[PDB]
Amino acid sequence: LAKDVTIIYTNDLHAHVEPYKVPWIADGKRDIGGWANITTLVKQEKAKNKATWFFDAGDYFTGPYISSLTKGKAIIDIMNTMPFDAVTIGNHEFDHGWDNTLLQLSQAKFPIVQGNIFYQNSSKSFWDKPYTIIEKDGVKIGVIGLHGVFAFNDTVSAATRVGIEARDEIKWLQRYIDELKGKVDLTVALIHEGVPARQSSMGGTDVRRALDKDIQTASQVKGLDILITGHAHVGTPEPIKVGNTLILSTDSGGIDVGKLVLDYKEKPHNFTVKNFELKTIYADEWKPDQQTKQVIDGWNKKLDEVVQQTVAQSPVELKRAYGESASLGNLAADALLAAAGKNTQLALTNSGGIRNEIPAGAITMGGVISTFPFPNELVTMELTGKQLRSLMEHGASLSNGVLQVSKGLEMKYDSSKPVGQRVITLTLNGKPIEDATVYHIATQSFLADGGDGFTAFTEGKARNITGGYYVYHAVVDYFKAGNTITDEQLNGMRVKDIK
């Protein structure tokens, strides 16, 4: 009666539907990922072994323009061609508003689980299905979907979650564990939680990211067999054992896919790990599933006319960094400053909002959208020097990366100092920022409402928001207005760790 039970999982796929280059993998010279390749991988596993499940821990939206320009519709369409047994809902599924979340995810032909997001001051749940039971070859797996409260408040834009909220994930996890006890062979939780992923062209040396939250979660509940996590984009080359729970994750974007083979016996109810592999997907090692590819191709054809348009050019690949300035952040802040105009003195934008490199050569509308994919609207406001400095300290804490800043603003911090005391110098046009002085600043609506823990933005006065005018429009308009990429945008270390 002993049975091979196989769990295959992804997380944080982020709309990377086609194979793509990653600067820190084979020096950006080898295609990785591709959802059509992942489909072949899973179909082949499911053909070999009946008791095979495919799960995803959220954040399949947001990234390459195919997601943003369709508000995620194309992503659900493509996912409908893939053999998912269950997924949960990550923060990025909310990027186009929670009404859009309901609208698009209603179209999914695979099960979606989410049991701890509620209407505020209500017992009513946001999603209809907190968990579900998926049985294959006499083996029943109960799968629970949850979002960390901290991560929900930290990374869902304020404007897209008005009137909804995540609630104590630990309380709901134990409740659902207890509700499933005696009804299933194995209990799995898909939990979207923790610190946000680093957004960087440099990979792992650019701000440490770990899975401490998930270890905490596992150690706070009893009776959970597997915790699949997403949100931090930190893969687990071996399962992390906490008590009797295995914690599993991937590096995100379809770079790798996890595969856990268990030996299971229902009679003496026991599972033991038989084999685990976190497999790097190299496009040239896989035949893409033709149906998945066809749906992707049909969507690209629809979008081509809009995205193909040339908006600029760059002599070099434009890069991003999470702990310091990089060219894409310098350009985005300069574009925001340019678009705000008038008396604006400086612009700030978040490192986590910059999602891809822009390759060298002709820059197209699609490339700009893939890099700056958020409906985050231009906001101008007045902040004191003291408030600006508090924002800089929050950035230097590296919990959510540093702010990227406009030309003229320079910030130096020391990451070896205690959080709260890391800013060394902060100057605008060579003069120190002064506590009581009032500065005219530009940013966007995600930061303006306190996104990423940047709370002092919410104290800004004389606030003005431009509806429908996003970071990517500002960037496009920057090149339309005559401006080009400058050497100081390319090499200027406006924000720098002097550790």
Near ligand URI by CB under 6 A, which window of 161-169, 348-356, 427-435, 461-469? 348-356
Using DSSP, state whether 497 is helix, strand or coil.
Answer: strand
The verdict on 197 binding ligand URI (CB under 6 A) reads: yes
d(CA 365, CA 478): 13
The C-alpha atoms of residue 461 and residue 198 are separated, in whole angstroms, by: 31
> Closest Cα to residue 331, out of 319, 344, 316?
319
The partner in contact with residue 352, picked from ligand URI, Mn ion, Cl ion, none with C-beta cut-offs of 5 to 8 angstroms by kind, is ligand URI
The gap from C-alpha 288 to its chain's centroid, in whole angstroms, comes to 25
Q: Could you give the maximum distance between any two Cα atoms of the chain, in Å? A: 75
CB of 336 to Mn ion, least distance (A): 24
Comparing CB distances to Cl ion, the nearer of 64 and 148 is 148
Choices 266-274, 346-354, 473-481, 482-490 (CB under 6 A): range interacting with ligand URI: 346-354
Rounded to whole angstroms, the Cα distance separating 103 from 93 reads: 11
> Is 353 one of the binding residues for ligand URI (CB under 6 A)?
yes
Binding status of residue 90 toward Fe ion by CB under 5 A:
yes
In angstroms, rounded to a whole number, what is the distance separating the alpha carbons of residues 408 and 429? Answer: 5
Q: Establish if 373 lies at the interface with ligand URI (CB under 6 A).
A: no
Give the rounded distance of the alpha carbon of 448 from its chain centre.
Answer: 19
**Of the ranges 186-194, 267-275, 328-336, 345-353, which one interacts with ligand URI (CB under 6 A)?**
345-353
Of the candidate residues 59, 251, 334, 410, the single one contacting Fe ion (CB under 5 A): 59
The region of 30-38, 55-63, 108-116, 371-379 touching Fe ion under the rule CB under 5 A is 55-63
CA distances from 290 to 37, 143, 169, 297, 314 (A): 9, 29, 39, 10, 35
Minimum separation from the CB atom of position 379 to ligand URI (A) = 13
Applying CB under 5 A, which of residues 6, 91, 250, 404 lies at the interface with Fe ion?
91
Nearer to Mn ion, 116 or 314 (CB): 116
* Site membership for Fe ion, residue 231 (CB under 5 A): yes
Shorter beta-carbon distance to ligand URI: residue 45 or 154: 154
Of 110, 89, 115, whose CA–CA distance to 176 is shortest? 115
Closer Cβ to ligand URI, 166 or 295, answer by number: 166
Cβ of residue 117: shortest distance to Cl ion, in angstroms?
Answer: 13
What the block records as the tokens of 134 is 């998926």
Asked if residue 148 binds Cl ion (CB under 5 A), the reply is: yes
Name the minimum Å distance from CB 94 to Fe ion.
10
- Show the beta-strand stretches assigned E in 249-306: 256-265, 270-280
Q: How many of the chain's residues bind Fe ion (CB under 5 A)? A: 4
Distance CA 190, CA 475 (A): 36
Which residues contact residue 40 at a Cβ distance below 8 angstroms, ignoring those fewer than 6 apart? 286, 287, 288, 289
Residues 6+ apart with CB under 8 A from 85: 53, 54, 55, 110, 111, 134, 143
Instruction: Indicate which single residue of 101, 116, 157, 406 sits in contact with ligand URI (rule: CB under 6 A).
Output: 157
Provide the mask over 168-207, with x wherever binding to Cl ion is found by CB under 5 A and - wherever it is not. Answer: -------------------------x--------------
> Is-contact 232 90, C-beta < 8 A?
no
- The answer to whether 428 touches 409, Cβ cutoff 8 Å, is yes
The Cα 407–Cα 329 span in angstroms is: 11
Span of 211-219, 334-342, 347-355, 488-496 interacting with ligand URI by CB under 6 A: 347-355
**From CA 273, how far away is CA 245, in angstroms rounded?**
11
The dihedral region occupied by 243, where left means phi > 0, alpha psi between -120 and 50, and beta the remainder, is left
| Residues at the interface with Mn ion (CB under 5 A) | 12, 59
Give the interface segment with Fe ion, choosing from 21-29, 54-62, 207-215, 476-484 (CB under 5 A). 54-62
In the list Fe ion, Mn ion, Cl ion, none, the entry touching 91 (Cβ below 5 to 8 angstroms by class) is Fe ion
Nearest distance from residue 221's CB to Cl ion, in Å? 15
Backbone angles phi, psi at 236, to 5 degrees: -120, 95
Closest to Cl ion by CB, 193 vs 410, is: 193
From the list Fe ion, Cl ion, Mn ion, none, pick the one residue 373 interacts with, judged by a Cβ distance below 5 to 8 Å according to partner type. Answer: none
Which residue of 6, 292, 350, 387 would you call a contact of ligand URI, by CB under 6 A? 350
Residue 480 CB: number of other CB atoms within 10 A?
11
Smallest distance, Mn ion to C-beta of residue 250, A = 11
The yes or no reply on residue 150 touching Cl ion (CB under 5 A) is yes
φ, ψ dihedrals at 379, nearest 5°: -135, 140
Query: Is the Cβ of residue 71 or residue 213 nearer to Cl ion in the bound state?
Result: 213
446 binds ligand URI, rule: CB under 6 A: yes
Q: Which does 357 bind (CB under 5 to 8 A by kind): ligand URI, Fe ion, Cl ion, none?
A: none
Note the residues at the interface with ligand URI (CB under 6 A).
Answer: 95, 155, 157, 196-197, 350, 352-353, 374, 376, 400, 446, 452
Give the binding site for Cl ion (CB under 5 A).
148, 150-151, 193
